[PDB]
């Protein structure tokens, strides 16, 4: 585990000692690797920057440059945390707590998302030690990648107004059913802006010279549309692909460079990496020993290493 | 019972007339709504004079 401890610094509200008991299996973001550390850098008051608190995109950027840690065992003197970034060498598969409305799967990669849900705030309050605690919500990673694209684009609509007030909310989610509504309260600009720029600048490099030949086959896409099932379902209705349909540009130097093969490389370099440069890295994977295929809300799932 | 000045006013035959009849054949396809890949080769002929 390469054991790391966090002590109980000063005093105890006597029911709130039991509040630390039911947080077993949650995640602490501690911005270090320590053998002992105070509880002051733990809470959300440390997540608050100079003067201002981060938004749910800034908390992504706040959870960027800190280190997650697993609650292992809860003492009245200390709390032993295992440093996820290094000390994931656990054949004992140190256990986590699922605090999420989604019943997951077996075999999901699990990445951490700030509490942004309408009813799972994960707000526990300490008044003897005046601190506020937001636990991250562990979620499956495609469902995690369906969230971060919404919240930045919702902040993309925070730059430009123009349109009438009835906008698509980006606030109805879909997992097999299960209509989810999240919170849209505040959108800090710099958390939107720096997230928007890497969405711009990576999509710059992901276009290359041999990429341009693929753009010719855009009318070839709709030729498969009215003659099969798979393509017509692949072609989305709310897509620009159905909108843009309504050429080599020769410039041929040398022609032994494999121009089409080189196109799919650098496209995958930056447009292939769009979930992980915006959000947190997944290192938690669902692995139950008993053959249980799903893990209930509130359960203690065994946790294995990087996916 | 048709008298004189009725068929006397058949004088107006010089203005409009018709020469002969002609079979019109202009076929069709299935609609937007049934036109699929197998039905794209389908034609339906319609004849009329």
In short:
The structure is cut from a larger assembly and holds chains A (307 residues) and B (49 residues). Chain A is of the alpha+beta class and 307 residues long.
What labels describe this entry?
part of a larger assembly; 2 chains; A: 307 residues; alpha+beta; five-stranded mixed beta sheet; elongated; B: 49 residues; little secondary structure; two-stranded antiparallel ribbon; 10% helix; rod-shaped; Major capsid protein (chain B); structural molecule activity (chain A); Capsid triplex subunit 2 (chain A); capsid protein (chain A); host nucleus (chain A)
Task: Give a verbal description of the structure.
The structure is cut from a larger assembly and holds chains A (307 residues) and B (49 residues). Chain A contains 8 helices and 13 strands. Chain A is of the alpha+beta class and 307 residues long. In chain A, a hairpin with a 4-residue loop joins strand 8 and strand 9 (131-134). Chain B is largely without helices or strands and 49 residues long. Chain B is built from 1 helix and 2 strands, in the order αββ. Chain B has one helix at 4-8; strands spanning 24-25, 47-48. Chain B is rod-shaped, with a radius of gyration of 23 Å. The chains hardly touch. It is classed as viral protein.
CA distance, first residue to last residue of chain B: 32 Å
- Classify the beta-strand content of chain B into a percent band: 5-15%
Q: What is the number of helical segments of chain A per DSSP (H or I, 4+ residues)? A: 8
**Oligomeric status of the shown chains?**
part of a larger assembly
Structural class of chain B: little secondary structure
Sheet of most strands of chain B: 2 strands, antiparallel
Structural class, judged by helices and strands of chain A? alpha+beta
Distance between the termini of chain A: 19 Å
Helices and strands of chain A, in N-to-C order? EHEEHHEEEEEEEHHHHHEEE
Bin the helical content of chain B: 10-25%
Q: Rough shape of chain A?
A: elongated
**Order of strands side by side in the largest beta sheet of chain A?**
2-4-5-1-3
Please count the beta strands of chain B (DSSP E, at least 2 residues each).
2
């Amino acid at each position: 585990c390469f054991e790391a401890d966090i002590a109980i610094p000063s005093g105890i509200s006597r029911p709130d000692a039991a509040a630390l008991q039911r947080c077993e299996g949650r995640v602490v973001f501690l911005p270090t690797i320590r053998r002992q550390l105070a509880l002051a850098d733990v809470a959300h008051e440390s997540f608050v920057s100079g003067g201002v608190s981060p938004d749910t995109l800034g908390l992504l950027l706040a959870y960027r440059r800190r280190f997650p840690a697993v609650i292992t065992r809860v003492l009245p003197t200390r709390i032993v945390a295992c440093p996820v970034d290094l000390g994931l060498t656990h054949a004992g598969t140190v256990n986590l707590r699922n605090t999420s409305p989604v019943d997951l799967c077996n075999g999901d990669p699990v990445s951490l998302v700030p509490p942004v849900f309408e009813g799972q705030a994960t707000d526990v309050r300490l008044e003897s030690l005046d601190l506020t605690l937001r636990f991250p919500v562990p979620l499956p990673t495609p469902l995690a990648r369906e969230i971060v694209a919404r919240l930045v684009a919702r902040g993309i609509r925070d730059l430009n107004p123009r349109t009438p007030g009835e906008l698509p909310d980006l606030n109805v989610l879909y997992y097999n059913g299960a209509r989810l509504s999240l919170v849209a309260d505040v959108q800090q600009l710099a958390s939107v802006n720096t997230e928007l720029r890497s969405l711009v600048l990576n999509m710059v490099y992901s276009i290359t010279e041999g990429t341009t030949l693929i753009l010719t086959l855009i009318p070839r896409l709709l030729a498969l549309s009215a003659q099969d099932g798979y393509v017509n379902a692949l072609l989305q209705m709310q897509s620009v692909t159905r909108e843009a349909a309504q050429a080599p540009m020769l410039m041929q130097d040398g022609e032994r460079r494999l121009p089409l093969y080189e196109a799919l490389v650098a496209w995958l370099a930056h447009a292939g990496q769009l979930g992980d440069i915006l959000a947190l890295a997944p290192a938690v994977r669902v692995c139950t020993f008993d053959g249980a295929a799903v893990v209930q809300s509130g359960d203690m799932a065994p946790v294995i290493r990087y996916p | 019972v048709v008298d004189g000045p009725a068929m006397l006013t058949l004088q107006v035959l010089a203005h409009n007339m018709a020469e002969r009849t002609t079979a019109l054949l202009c076929s069709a396809a299935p609609d937007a709504g049934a036109n699929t890949a197998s039905t794209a080769n389908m034609r339906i002929f319609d004849g009329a004079l």
